[model samples]
Target: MLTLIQGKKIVNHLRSRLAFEYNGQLIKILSKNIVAVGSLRREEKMLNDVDLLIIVPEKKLLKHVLPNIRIKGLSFSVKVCGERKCVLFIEWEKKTYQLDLFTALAEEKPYAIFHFTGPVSYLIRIRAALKKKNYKLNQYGLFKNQTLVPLKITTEKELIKELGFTYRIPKKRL
Candidate 1:
């Protein structure tokens, strides 16, 4: 089994390289790996993969940037994907590790966090309920009648409250 320590070693290296590349753009390491390490602290289970969300400042750079990263005996295959722009799929270590990247607008950071940290089906349900309540939910902030709502949401807790739902940590989000 691939232990969390091994996976984290890979992410920490990648994140370090990415940090220098950000250049003031909004970039975050997201999803399963974060949940595994952050809240759970890798005390019980191992991580299956790593997911990264990079909000590219320039759309054009998405294509030319993010070349394959090689370290020691590890190499990654980086490919752009998703219907939306700036998505990348990285495979490495022959299934021992993988990384996924998705992009979002700067103003849409909160929503992007929610979306990537979600059980998509559950979010769809909450989104529909919020829509019924005249609120729009996407990888952006809450909107009403196509206009932004006056709300300050900086964390998932706030977003849960904004959607009129009880708070649940990212671990339970699965």
Candidate 2:
């Protein structure tokens, strides 16, 4: 079975090797193993995949490195998993692991992370609330119709406050 500790070790190992990357920085490891509110149970569960979000200043560099991540003599294959998203599939020991990758810029850091690390239903609820207020919440941040609205949110808490919702901890977000 794929234990949480083993998954963390893999994340730590990758972070050590690719954390200080030349073109991008690994901002956060948003895996199921985190000991947060909604993720608490995940701390005791076994997961089949690991997830990571990186800040790549340039799109070209993000695309280039996604397909060729090599560490400790192990090679990874990259696949376009979604819009502006990619995942690294690796085979280690007798197990397979998938590293979900999301690329973003510094300005989009907080919101991008907020949406990327979220449980879909939680986000959907928040988005519906924002829609009622004529504001849009997405990976690209808050927006009004086609125009982007300026805000001073740097975390999920601030974003929720700005959206007029009760603050929900990452754990409670489950």
Candidate 3:
């Protein structure tokens, strides 16, 4: 595992390097939409993998994005590339780091970020709370009886409020 500072440094390195090489196409489509999530987002003292949530205009673009990020001397391989996520093994400074890239459509960005930015315990509590209210929550969206619940949730705070909980910052979620 990497200390929080080290993890953040790696993320920053990758973000700028990839942005420079790809003309910022991979990191940003219209704006700076790619975000660090998971343990990194939570400000944990130690981290296992670095997770990034990227908002793309279309799902098909995900297939081409990861492979095109060229790091000067470091090497990386795409372990799994799917419609919604990609797993990458990046070799940097003689150590292998796991990188998870989660892609979502613009409308799905907030929900995906909220789901993936969690401490499992915190998400479980939210799920239990939602369950009692007859709502199912996931990375996609909220649902009721197998049907999607339309809610204008554009931010993590709004999502928490919509699900009937007071919002907590990522670092304070637990």
lDDT of candidate 2 over 27-108, digit per residue (tens) = 3332321222112233445655666666655556545555444454466776778676767778879666676766666456
Backbone clash pairs for candidate 3 read none
Give TM per candidate: 0.61, 0.72, 0.74
Model 1 root mean square deviation, Cα atoms: 5.9
lDDT string, candidate 1, 1-174, tens digits: 456676566566665545212444544332322222221232335655555565544454443334432223334555556655333344455553445555555455556666666666677878788888898876646688999764466576776676567754456654
Reference-based lDDT, residue 130, model 3: 80
Q: What is the lDDT of candidate 2?
A: 0.59
Candidate lDDT (C-alpha), each: 0.53, 0.59, 0.69
Residue 167 miss distance in model 2 (angstroms): 3.2
Superposed Cα deviation of residue 117, candidate 1 (Å):
2.5
Question: Candidate 2: lDDT of 86?
Answer: 69
**Clash totals, every prediction:** 0, 2, 0
Candidate 3 residue 65 C-alpha distance from true site, Å: 4.2
* Model 3 Cα lDDT, one tens digit per residue, 1-174: 878887778777766665312434544343266687765677678877788877766566644565554444567876666665678788878988888877666667767776776667888887878888888887667789899876686787887776676655666655
Best by TM-score: 3
Candidate 1: segments with Cα more than 4 A from true spot: 19-44, 55-74, 85-97, 146-151
